[PDB]
């Protein structure tokens, strides 16, 4: 039995925001302005179809995709990329784009996103509101 990812979540803590955002080329001014924002994200899941509205520092980023099909995503820099998101197990959405691996895992009321960019691990932990 798979879990639904639907909900609104607020950022609780995060590790390596600065390193990660600098590596992907976010303007320094947005790094400074964005690093202390604990924003609210929303996931709407209809079956295998998902709509995410994510607060990523100073930007709202909206994505939409169906598991196992090619999708266009906007990255945290608003670059557009083509990839595919898969469900791994009961509680994890996993995708790879550019040189980034992204795992989003729901445990109860806590959603953890880890993005690995070479040796940088950017982790964000958010809690259901």
In this structure, what token pair is assigned to residue 66? 């169906």
Q: 84: domain CATH number?
A: 2.40.128.20
Domain that holds residue 110: 7-128
> Residue 120 pairs with which residues in a beta bridge?
117
| Distance, CA of 116 to CA of 124 (rounded, Å) | 12
Q: Is residue 40 part of a domain?
A: yes
Experimental method: X-ray
| Distance, CA of 118 to CA of 16 (rounded, Å) | 13
**Pair 59, 78: CB distance under 8 Å:** yes
Q: Exposed e or buried b for every residue in 111-125, given b needs 16+ CB within 10 A?
A: bebbbbbeeeebbbb
Q: Is residue 2 part of a domain?
A: no
Other Cβ atoms closer than 10 A to 29: 9
Query: Which three-class secondary structure state does DSSP give residue 88?
Result: strand
In this structure, what token pair is assigned to residue 9? 């979540």
Q: What's the resolution in A?
A: 1.6
How many domains, in total, are found in the chain?
1
Contacts of 98 (CB under 8 A, 6+ apart): 24, 75, 81
| Distance, CA of 66 to CA of 81 (rounded, Å) | 15
Provide the pairing of β-strand 7-15 with 120-128: antiparallel
Q: Is residue 108 part of a domain?
A: yes
Measured in degrees and rounded to the nearest 5, phi and psi for residue 103 equal: -120, 125
Q: Is residue 88 part of a domain?
A: yes
């Amino acid at each position: 039995s798979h879990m639904s990812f639907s909900g609104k979540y607020q950022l609780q803590s995060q590790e390596n925001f600065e390193a990660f955002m600098k590596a992907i080329g976010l303007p320094e001014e947005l790094i400074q302005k964005g690093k202390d924002i604990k924003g609210v994200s929303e996931i709407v899941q209809n079956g295998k179809h998902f709509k995410f509205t994510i607060t990523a520092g100073s930007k709202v980023i909206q994505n939409e995709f169906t598991v196992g099909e090619e999708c266009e995503l906007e990255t945290m820099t608003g670059e557009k990329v083509k990839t595919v998101v898969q469900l791994e197990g009961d509680n994890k959405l996993v995708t790879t784009f550019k040189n980034i691996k992204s795992v989003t895992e729901l445990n109860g009321d806590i959603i953890t996103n880890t993005m690995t960019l070479g040796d940088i691990v950017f982790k964000r932990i958010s809690k259901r509101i």
